[PDB]
Design a protein around this ligand. Structure first.
Ligand SMILES: [Fe+2]
Ligand code: NA
Length: 668
């Protein structure tokens, strides 16, 4: 086997690299990498303006050719084999035009400056006394004329690749071939936690992988499970045997698990509920099985009990979408082990769906567009201070997932998922083509045990208070620089997906059943705009250069949406990955060879390498936990939000939630 040797050397290689980085050598390089990307903020050139010289011009985005507005510019002298010299500061106007006053005399050495224009980025931090701290970063450098001896030097109109859009993605994403040159890097802490976690967990996965080549049936599932730390379900079953396989727990995790199911209620019998996963739209891979599974529940006295689970499976042959299905089967809670096996199958469909749609699609992809637009257009406007800390760093993790999670042949969700890469992708494009911010609100609690709904609504009201307060406080500044909000809106609409009414797994085909709550769902009746000849999925926040009641409310809602999904939602879906899928016997992204058998059957379960990679990835992804609202390890979370969340600590406690476990952003 040609693959065995290279696989081994690759696992070894990975291990060694992690040794190097998770060490003094690695840490020094990381920390210094962080320190160099800080631009020393220069002081104003106080001197008579007549005695000063000037440089003028206009800056445009390289991809939209729109003005690069309100961005800081520094005039420097670039000298060969000599340190550069600072000559003057200034900003672009809303048309990207600039008239920088610079002093040639800070040349010192030469008779005339050889000009160099720097585009300057910056992050805002709050100090001890809650006052803004501006930390610069060099965004771009343009070479200007040499021997400049004119009292006005003009660059004219130039383009700048500032946060460019990826033209090869079906999604609005940043263009980042080299993730090593991100314009928004992680914190050194986030990096350190990552490399540490990986250094602990990777030698295990490596051991298993190397072991698998020596014997394709080894290591056992028992050995793989043992060699990793236990998860929630293992612990639970260690206290009370078989608890997590019970109906009560099945329902609880359907409601509040990693994939918190938005159930369908019956129109005739409002006590009847169901959840459908149908994959007729998608291409099955050759290894795993595919199951159209539907779980039915009844509501009795504020409790949800499972009534049946129907399973309709693809033949192993049935690869292409809409290929033949085996006869649908029906399972009730008294059908014993076939009932238990049905519950496991449902769990796996729910886990793969949860990772594709609820996680990767709804959280990562949907929020990246807001990130890119935000950092593209929000500078002078206070809303920046409100949005950036939640949208920062997400470009990094998505670009990483391009290799780690959703790579055409090596990514976990593709490989371990029952679909081909085109299938998984199709799920993603399908749902993201319908995600908008307008009139969006969290689902309502079906019952008292519906923890996620209660949690989500509480958090939502917190966000409402926060947003209202913030908008009130910075009203004048928000209005004064509303143009930024317009450019923000325009970038969002223009770069979003073309709208496409829902289809596939998340589309209801049932006449009897309707979504019990529609607040999170797509509102097709609400008008959407058109760009480039297609109706766009994201609705515009504004189309005027000054705010109005409508426009302001629009912005407030968009802000609520963004903050909600970048904090609580992603927290919930991501940090629940171990709890749902840490134990192989209980859950996986797919099943094999009929999917029916005892949960100890290694033929049904993932093969050793898929298994170990499953547990590895879940444990890593939930094991890295940097960036929490309460902890505020980056000192950039506006204090109003913090105090709003802290104020409501105990109501969250009453739902078994620590507000300190709520992440600030998406960076894992
Ligand atoms: Fe994530
Ligand atoms: Na696959």
């Amino acid at each position: 086997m040609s693959t065995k040797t290279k696989t081994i050397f690759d696992e070894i290689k990975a291990a060694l690299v992690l040794k190097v980085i998770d060490s003094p050598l690695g840490r020094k390089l990381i920390e210094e990498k962080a320190e160099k990307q800080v631009s020393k903020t220069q002081e104003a050139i106080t001197k008579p303006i007549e005695q000063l010289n000037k440089a003028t011009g206009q800056l445009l985005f390289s991809d939209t050719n729109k003005p690069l507005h309100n961005i800081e510019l520094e005039v420097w002298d670039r000298d060969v084999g000599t340190p550069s010299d600072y000559l003057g500061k200034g900003v672009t106007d809303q048309n990207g035009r600039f008239e920088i006053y610079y002093d040639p005399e800070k040349a010192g050495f030469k008779d005339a400056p050889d000009l160099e224009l720097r585009v300057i980025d910056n992050r805002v931090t709050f100090d001890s006394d809650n006052q803004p701290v501006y930390t610069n970063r060099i965004a771009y450098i343009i070479k200007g004329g040499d021997n400049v001896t004119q009292k006005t030097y003009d660059f004219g109109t130039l383009t700048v690749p500032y946060w460019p859009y990826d033209p090869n993605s079906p999604f609005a994403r940043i263009f980042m071939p080299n993730p090593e040159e991100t314009p928004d890097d992680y914190s050194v802490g986030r990096k350190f936690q990552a490399y540490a976690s990986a250094n602990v967990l990777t030698p295990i996965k490596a051991k298993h992988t190397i072991a698998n080549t020596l014997n394709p049936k080894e290591p056992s599932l028992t050995q793989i499970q043992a060699d990793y730390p236990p998860n929630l379900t293992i612990n639970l079953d260690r206290e009370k045997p078989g608890y997590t396989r019970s109906d009560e727990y099945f329902v609880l995790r359907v409601l509040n698990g990693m994939n918190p199911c938005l159930l369908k209620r019956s129109k005739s019998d409002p006590n009847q509920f169901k959840m459908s996963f149908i994959w007729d739209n998608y291409e099955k891979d050759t290894e795993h099985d595919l199951h159209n599974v539907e779980a039915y529940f009844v509501l009795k006295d504020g409790k949800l009990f499972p009534t049946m689970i129907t399973i309709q499976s693809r033949y192993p042959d049935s690869l292409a979408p809409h290929s033949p299905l085996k006869d649908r089967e029906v399972y009730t809670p008294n059908d014993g082990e076939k009932w238990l096996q049905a519950k496991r199958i449902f769990r796996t469909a729910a886990l793969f769906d949860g990772e594709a749609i609820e996680h990767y699609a709804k959280a990562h992809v949907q929020m990246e567009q807001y990130a890119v637009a935000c950092f593209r257009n929000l500078r002078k406007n206070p809303i920046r201070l409100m949005l950036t800390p939640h949208l920062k760093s997400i470009i990094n993790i998505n670009r990483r997932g391009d290799d780690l999670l959703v790579e055409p042949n090596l990514g976990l969700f593709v490989t371990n998922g029952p679909l081909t890469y085109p299938g998984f992708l199709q799920m993603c494009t399908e749902v993201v083509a319908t995600y908008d911010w307008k009139d969006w609100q969290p689902r309502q609690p079906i019952c008292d045990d519906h923890k996620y709904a209660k949690a989500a609504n509480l958090y939502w009201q917190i966000l409402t208070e926060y947003v209202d307060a913030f908008f009130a406080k910075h009203q004048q500044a928000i209005a004064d620089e509303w143009v930024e909000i317009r450019r923000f809106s325009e970038d969002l609409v223009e770069h979003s997906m073309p709208y496409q009414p829902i289809e596939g797994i998340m589309a209801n085909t049932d006449s009897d059943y309707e979504w019990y709550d529609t607040g999170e769902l797509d509102k097709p009746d609400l008008p959407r705009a058109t760009f480039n000849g297609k109706t766009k999925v994201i609705r515009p926040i504004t189309n005027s250069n000054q705010p109005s009641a409508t426009d302001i409310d629009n912005l407030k809602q968009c802000c609520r949406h963004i903050i909600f999904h970048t904090t609580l939602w992603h927290t919930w879906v991501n940090d629940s990955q171990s709890d749902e899928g840490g134990e192989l016997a209980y859950n996986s992204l797919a099943l094999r060879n009929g999917s029916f058998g005892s949960e100890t059957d290694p033929n049904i379960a993932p093969d050793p390498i898929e298994a170990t990679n499953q547990v590895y990835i879940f444990s890593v992804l939930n094991g890295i936990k940097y960036g929490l609202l309460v902890k505020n390890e980056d000192d950039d979370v506006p204090e109003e939000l913090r105090t709003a969340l802290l104020n409501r600590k105990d109501q969250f406690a009453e739902l078994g939630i620590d507000i300190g476990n709520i992440r600030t952003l998406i960076n894992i």
